């Protein structure tokens, strides 16, 4: 209920109301300025129609969880410059979880044709 409750009527009826008596006073929540950021956020088209896919609430407190659940992906081809050939291409297959994954460290870990050179560099440094 919303009006509270009273006892059954007695000789002395005492109940408490909001005694401000504020006629022409109505309650509203301060409406959120709900910005709807719409942009290309995944590496592919989805077959799911636009009315069925859902909005994702993002704050500061779960942004890594939003990038985590988003299951990001890029599958593409780059020019390979570990040798002296133009036709030599390097296929990459990456997986992304947070904004650490765009650094050259994690990118250096997620392509084995660079990961073996990082480890080989670790062989040359340790000697």
């Amino acid at each position: 209920s919303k009006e509270g409750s009273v006892a059954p009527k007695e000789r002395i009826n005492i109940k408490y109301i909001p005694a401000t008596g504020d006629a022409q006073a109505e309650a509203e929540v301060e409406l959120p300025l709900k910005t709807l950021v719409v942009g290309d956020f995944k590496g592919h088209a989805e077959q799911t129609p636009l009315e069925e896919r859902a909005t994702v609430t993002v704050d500061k407190n779960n942004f890594e969880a939003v990038m985590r659940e988003s299951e990001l992906k890029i599958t593409a081809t780059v020019k390979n410059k570990l040798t002296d050939d133009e036709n030599a291409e390097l296929p990459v297959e990456l997986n992304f979880k947070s904004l650490a994954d765009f650094a050259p460290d994690a990118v250096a870990s997620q392509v084995p044709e660079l990961k073996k050179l990082i480890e080989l560099r670790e062989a040359l440094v340790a000697l």
Partner: protein, 430 residues
């Protein structure tokens, strides 16, 4: 012996950095990294402990166009159901305040049909759509020739742009804003300045400036909307170096020029002020770099719609005055917030014993909340009570009882947007 091992380390770092330059400059990877890193740049500069929510919907442009054309009208699409029907017109929901498009727009007929339809969605849902003008919208390669274009007003008369000039004159161009040039998200890597773990990487950025990570401007404009709302519970304050529109903290990149040092500009160009006023007259929001700093500013936030010319009489200048108030975003955000409060609060009175003068009294006492009509209010009280006058007329729909017809007309505080000065030495003056 050891020096040969170190030379093998330098050559090997040239190899791994040589490949890493090719992966990190991948165009799809720049799209992903630009969208998400720019998204965090928007997110962490807002203040979510002051009732702001940002929602994410993964949409590419081709399914906005395929969606809208597959929809029988604008009123049954998917995005109309995520913005309007699940929001503004749902019992108990919350209105969409603004829509930020992480897109880039060309003069191609799919893009202008997209902006006609998003003008319609912004019409029925009271949500301004903000996006980015791409480099080929002006007829040039990239943004580093805005000092080299002689005249924009004579550029836009070509028959390439006929659809665009058909778009500005439409009555739904109050709800669009297209933003001019982009800006940096990320300092290019270096051993010292932005290091990487367990490796020596030195990002060799060439003369071609696509190798930088460019983020969207519309995110930065969205930081100005959401921050202004977090301070002041409204969004009229997005238009100055000091009034609220200042976007601070941009990354710099000091790199060796032909013998000297120079700062690579965080925006693509230093827009001179004549060029800014021209972009403001064309309906664009010019992100202007402050030269010698790392700070940028919106000197203007006009919307798309062409400001009309009326005859030079008394009534003509009043009607031009109203029509240029209508076509600028720091006033349409005021009318958007009034439209949202009027919808959301005036659904809670359906079923109360109201007469006509009841709505006059309750709306006038409702809107005396937002009137700041003293002699000289300071900047803050103007910031949180934006409208200076309000004149409400309530009439009945005759022969359809109870249905009331209301005209709510406001007069906002004019924000200082240009002046002409004439100076003259003289004697004899008092």
């Amino acid at each position: 012996n050891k020096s040969l091992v170190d030379q093998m380390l330098v050559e090997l770092d040239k190899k791994i950095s040589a490949q890493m330059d090719e992966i990190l400059h991948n165009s799809q990877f720049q799209a992903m990294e630009s969208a998400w890193r720019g998204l965090k740049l928007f997110v962490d500069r807002t203040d979510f402990r002051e009732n702001n929510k940002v929602e994410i919907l993964h949409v590419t442009k081709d399914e906005l166009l395929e969606d809208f054309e597959f929809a029988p009208e604008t009123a049954q699409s998917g995005l109309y159901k995520h913005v309007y029907s699940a929001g503004y017109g749902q019992f108990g929901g919350e209105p969409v305040g603004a829509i930020i498009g992480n897109y880039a727009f060309t003069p191609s007929t799919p893009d202008m049909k997209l902006l006609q339809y998003m003008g319609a969605l912004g019409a029925m849902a009271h949500a301004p759509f903000i996006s980015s003008v791409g480099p080929e919208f002006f007829g040039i390669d990239s943004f580093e020739e805005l000092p080299n274009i002689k005249d924009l007003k004579s550029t836009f008369e070509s028959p390439k742009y006929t659809k665009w000039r058909s778009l500005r004159e439409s009555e739904d161009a109050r709800y669009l804003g297209l933003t001019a040039p982009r800006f940096l998200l990320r300092v290019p890597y270096d051993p010292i300045e932005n290091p990487v773990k367990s490796f020596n990487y030195a990002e060799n950025v060439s003369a071609s400036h696509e190798h930088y990570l460019w983020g969207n401007t519309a995110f930065a404009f969205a930081t100005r909307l959401t921050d202004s709302f977090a301070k002041y519970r409204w969004c009229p304050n997005i238009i100055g170096p000091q009034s609220g529109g200042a976007v601070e903290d941009l990354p710099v990149h000091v790199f060796e020029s032909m013998g000297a040092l120079q700062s690579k500009i965080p925006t693509e160009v230093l827009i001179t002020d004549r060029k800014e006023f021209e972009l403001a007259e064309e309906g664009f929001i010019a992100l202007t770099m402050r030269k010698g700093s790392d700070n940028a500013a919106f000197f203007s936030a006009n919307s798309i719609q062409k400001p009309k010319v009326f005859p030079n009489t008394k009534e003509g200048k009043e009607a031009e005055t109203n029509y240029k108030l209508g076509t600028q975003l720091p006033y349409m955000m005021i009318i958007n917030r009034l439209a949202h409060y009027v919808k959301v609060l005036q659904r809670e009175q359906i079923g109360a014993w109201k007469e006509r003068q009841d709505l006059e009294r309750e709306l006038n006492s409702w809107i005396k909340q937002y009137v700041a009509d003293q002699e000289n209010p300071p900047a803050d009280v103007r910031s949180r009570r934006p409208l200076r006058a309000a004149r409400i007329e309530v009439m009945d729909v005759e022969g359809n009882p109870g249905w009331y017809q209301v005209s709510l007309s406001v007069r906002p505080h004019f924000k200082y947007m240009g002046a002409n000065f004439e100076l003259s030495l003289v004697g004899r003056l008092d």
